């Protein structure tokens, strides 16, 4: 196989691929690898245009969602952060394969473990402390919610970087942040 069926990513160095506040104003690098019932994930977000380059005084949180359908295939429409033309799929070299994901449920967060109506439940969350800029003097929290911004028969991943309130005139930028979850299949 030319591609790796155990990995779904945005490629290691994506171009601006999100229009969070304004058109293509951010780069979301996300890689998901399936290891049995657990997905090892590494996410990273950085502002490249507009307010994301200069965190507004009132901003306390910056977040993105990835909503998938019942086959685990990403849906490129609000509120999914990645734009329609953005790379997302099996890994093939430093790029993405053009094949459609046919084992998508292997990467989706398990709904028995994280019921769609349970996003507020601590268990549907994996919360950690990290640092803006990667600067240890600028602590922030990262919360990953599982299936909280769902449909039905659908799945989702939500990433919230909070505690930004006290960080101004700084571009929004996170370190590579790790996380994991039990898989649907």
């Amino acid at each position: 196989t030319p591609y790796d069926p155990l990995t779904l990513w945005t490629t290691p160095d994506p171009p601006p691929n999100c229009s969070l506040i304004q058109e293509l104003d951010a780069k979301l690098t996300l890689c998901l690898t399936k290891n049995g019932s657990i997905v090892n994930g590494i996410v990273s977000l950085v502002g490249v245009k507009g307010n994301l380059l200069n965190i507004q005084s009132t901003t306390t949180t910056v977040g993105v969602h990835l909503v998938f359908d019942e086959q685990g295939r990403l849906i490129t429409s609000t509120p999914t952060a990645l734009v329609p033309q953005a790379s997302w799929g099996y890994r093939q070299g430093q790029s993405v394969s053009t094949n459609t994901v046919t084992n998508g449920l292997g990467f989706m967060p398990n709904v028995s473990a994280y019921p769609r109506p349970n996003a507020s439940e601590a268990k549907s969350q994996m919360v950690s402390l990290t640092y803006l800029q990667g600067d240890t003097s600028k602590p922030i929290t990262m919360k990953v919610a599982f299936n909280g911004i769902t449909s039905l028969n659908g799945y989702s991943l939500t990433f919230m970087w909070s505690g930004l309130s006290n960080y101004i005139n700084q571009p929004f930028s996170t370190p590579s942040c790790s996380f994991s979850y039990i898989t649907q299949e």
Partner: protein, 124 residues
Amino acid sequence: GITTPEEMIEKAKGETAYLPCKFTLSPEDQGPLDIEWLISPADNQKVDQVIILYSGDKIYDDYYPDLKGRVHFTSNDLKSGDASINVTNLQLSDIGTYQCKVKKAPGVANKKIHLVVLVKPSGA
């Protein structure tokens, strides 16, 4: 891939720099075309700063403030295989490594150009 190696372009302040980036596409490269130019200024510590972008059949500029209005793709048909750009009225601040990334999943290529700007002509 891109048709030219990593090169060094030496120009004089005020002149215009032509940063060539021509590419060929493979039959396999069936994904959407993305062209991104980044820059790592010599004067500061920033690296890989987005300068101009071609995504979803549209051009997006206005990313790097100091380079505003002085960057444009040279070709009127990028898809044909030419991602080249021009940096007009060069300033000493423009010195740095400019990178051209041309992507067409699974295809990906990049080229690095080290642009040098001199107060007055001469590399003699």
